Design an enzyme around this catalytic site. Structure first.
Site, PDB file in Angstrom:
ATOM      1  N   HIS A  41       0.804  -1.218   0.000  1.00 50.82           N
ATOM      2  CA  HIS A  41       0.000   0.000   0.000  1.00 50.82           C
ATOM      3  C   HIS A  41       0.846   1.280   0.000  1.00 50.82           C
ATOM      4  O   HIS A  41       0.269   2.367  -0.052  1.00 50.82           O
ATOM      5  CB  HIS A  41      -1.077   0.031   1.100  1.00 50.82           C
ATOM      6  CG  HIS A  41      -0.565   0.138   2.500  1.00 50.82           C
ATOM      7  ND1 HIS A  41      -0.880  -0.813   3.449  1.00 50.82           N
ATOM      8  CD2 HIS A  41       0.187   1.099   3.080  1.00 50.82           C
ATOM      9  CE1 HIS A  41      -0.303  -0.405   4.568  1.00 50.82           C
ATOM     10  NE2 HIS A  41       0.356   0.735   4.389  1.00 50.82           N
ATOM     11  N   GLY A 143       2.385   6.461   9.367  1.00 45.93           N
ATOM     12  CA  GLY A 143       3.787   6.240   9.049  1.00 45.93           C
ATOM     13  C   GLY A 143       4.380   5.001   9.705  1.00 45.93           C
ATOM     14  O   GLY A 143       5.503   4.621   9.365  1.00 45.93           O
ATOM     15  N   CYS A 145       3.461   1.913   9.298  1.00 48.29           N
ATOM     16  CA  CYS A 145       3.384   0.737   8.449  1.00 48.29           C
ATOM     17  C   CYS A 145       4.765   0.277   8.010  1.00 48.29           C
ATOM     18  O   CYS A 145       5.660   1.096   7.815  1.00 48.29           O
ATOM     19  CB  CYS A 145       2.438   0.959   7.273  1.00 48.29           C
ATOM     20  SG  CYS A 145       0.756   1.449   7.761  1.00 48.29           S
TER      21      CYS A 145
END
Ligand SMILES: O=C(c1cc(=O)[nH]c2ccccc12)N1CCN(c2ccccc2F)CC1
Ligand SMILES: O=C(c1cc(=O)[nH]c2ccccc12)N1CCN(c2ccccc2F)CC1
Lengths: 304, 304
Positions: A41, A143, A145
């Site tokens: 993503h 942030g 991830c």
């Protein structure tokens, strides 16, 4: 003496954290050998988030669109590919800090340490359990991830988790290092049902053994129970059914304390039916289920 | 979202851990520059532990009696000296992994991360608070002495604690990196009184703000209180008196949530007088006091 929610030392994993930028999105990547692993993503725009066609989105991206930075040095991307929900970015330099590592898909009820990261930099480390409903109750912001979950066996880091998502309920979802999500979760900004989360019985029992070893013995009673009688109580209280395998894994703790597993089950039964009456166990006013029998033995024997 | 007992990433401290042996005793040392810091009780024998004359014991020891090992390489000891309850072992090699560091004496109520070590090897990392009674509720076994407590400011490691002792009560005592014990504790195997341990009010309030930011708002009420009225309740429940300085430090959390500090104090007052009624806050059935207002802001804003 003492019992804490102990995370593994995070140094070997800190040396693997990189920042990955694609377009205007930045998240964390894991640099092992000449490969950087990150959530796919990273290629989404705020328009794509509701239902992205990742294959189509990745086709409009070339190696030069993935900006990988380790500390302050830019890594050169020579290859890119999608494997389930992760992107594997091939870089021309092997990470000189790559530890001895494995990729493992952990089981529900098992525990692991999370190194929360932002912009490729580690901010903190905490201990988590993979819930029976395959979510984790982490602590993650925008942030975060690409932050990974792991376990360490002497010098070997077993990477088990990569952070991808926070459900509208505030719980966290993610994948193993092959990009396969734990649970039914998909990487799209949609409402997703996290199933009923049960209590990890074997871990609550392991933590009752830790309490006995560390002086807290008030909850011990003159009773015993059977697997089937205990499981009737575990069902009523949304606890995982106890199996003979669980009894066997509790064996070392039973032998060290001299309290039979079914005797500890009877104490747990009364704690569930009667509550804590305002008392605490190991500094907690509820039954803790994020310590496996291995975690209890390790913390109570000092394995480095 | 989410709120966890988060420790600092421990890598910079792992690169400083060494094993120190003197005679038949082994504990942990902290290697910074060309100096190894460790508890002076490394020079004790099981006969000396009740009342050691450290000056006399150290006089019978030479540089070659202190075996310092980093990983698998032996360090050469070229100097030794006692500074309060720590020994400073001068080695001929500066630690190539020495991070940017400071030695700080923390205040009661402040928090820090502990890297528990055995034989110079890190086993785990957890977050602690220096109790108002100057003890820490750690998790430590035989050989854990010399394990350090620390904080990190971007690249700088502030070492605040060195582990020396476990009181008969199962609580932990130790020194700052100049060898001065926190509290009235002395390094001798004797029964020592740890005073009455109060609850760090400013931290419980900071954690109530963390709960509000993370969805848990049930405990919020239609009441307010005054500093003096709240403090009458804090006294009755063994809570640290709240000061205007504490109100000021809670300012950013008050501004972010829109809940005045005295309004949060009124919620805490009712939680103390009425209990939790079987409910939880941030997954806990008791009031948590090991998160400072700085820890809450850092975890809720993602500072790396
Ligand atoms: O970094 C985050 C995030 C993760 C988290 O655990 N908690 C948060 C809390 C507040 C704000 C953001 C987050 N997200 C960006 C990527 N998100 C995404 C998922 C699937 C598809 C596309 C996506 F962009 C998930 C959300
Ligand atoms: O390593 C430990 C220890 C520390 C701890 O926090 N918990 C324990 C639990 C079980 C067994 C041992 C320990 N100790 C050896 C050195 N001790 C000592 C103190 C003062 C003077 C001399 C001494 F040898 C303190 C005890």
């Amino acid at each position: 003496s003492g019992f804490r929610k102990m995370a593994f030392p995070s140094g070997k994993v800190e040396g693997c954290m990189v920042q990955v930028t694609c377009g205007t999105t930045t998240l964390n990547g894991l640099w092992l050998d000449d490969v950087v692993y990150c959530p796919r993503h990273v290629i989404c725009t705020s328009e794509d988030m509701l239902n992205p066609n990742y294959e189509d989105l990745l086709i409009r991206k070339s190696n030069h669109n993935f900006l990988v930075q380790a500390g302050n040095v830019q890594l050169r991307v020579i290859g890119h590919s999608m494997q389930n929900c992760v992107l594997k970015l091939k870089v021309d330099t092997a990470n000189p800090k790559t530890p001895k590592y494995k990729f493992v898909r952990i089981q529900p009820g098992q525990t692991f340490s999370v190194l929360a990261c932002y912009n490729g930099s580690p901010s903190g480390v905490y201990q988590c359990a993979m819930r029976p409903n395959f979510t984790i109750k982490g602590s993650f912001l925008n942030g975060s991830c690409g932050s990974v979950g792991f376990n360490i066996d002497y010098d070997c880091v077993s990477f088990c988790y990569m952070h991808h998502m926070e459900l509208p309920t505030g719980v966290h979802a993610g994948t193993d290092l092959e990009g396969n999500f734990y649970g039914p979760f998909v990487d799209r900004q949609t409402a997703q049902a996290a199933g009923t989360d049960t209590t990890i019985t074997v871990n609550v029992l392991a933590w009752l053994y830790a309490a006995v070893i560390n002086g807290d013995r008030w909850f011990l009673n003159r009773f015993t129970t059977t697997l089937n009688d205990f499981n009737l109580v575990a069902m009523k209280y949304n606890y995982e059914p106890l199996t003979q395998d669980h009894v066997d894994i509790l064996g070392p703790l039973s032998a060290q304390t001299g309290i039979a597993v079914l005797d500890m089950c009877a104490s747990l039964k009364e704690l569930l039916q009667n509550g804590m009456n305002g008392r605490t166990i190991l500094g907690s006013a509820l039954l803790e289920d994020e310590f496996t029998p291995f975690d209890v033995v390790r913390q109570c024997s000092g394995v480095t």
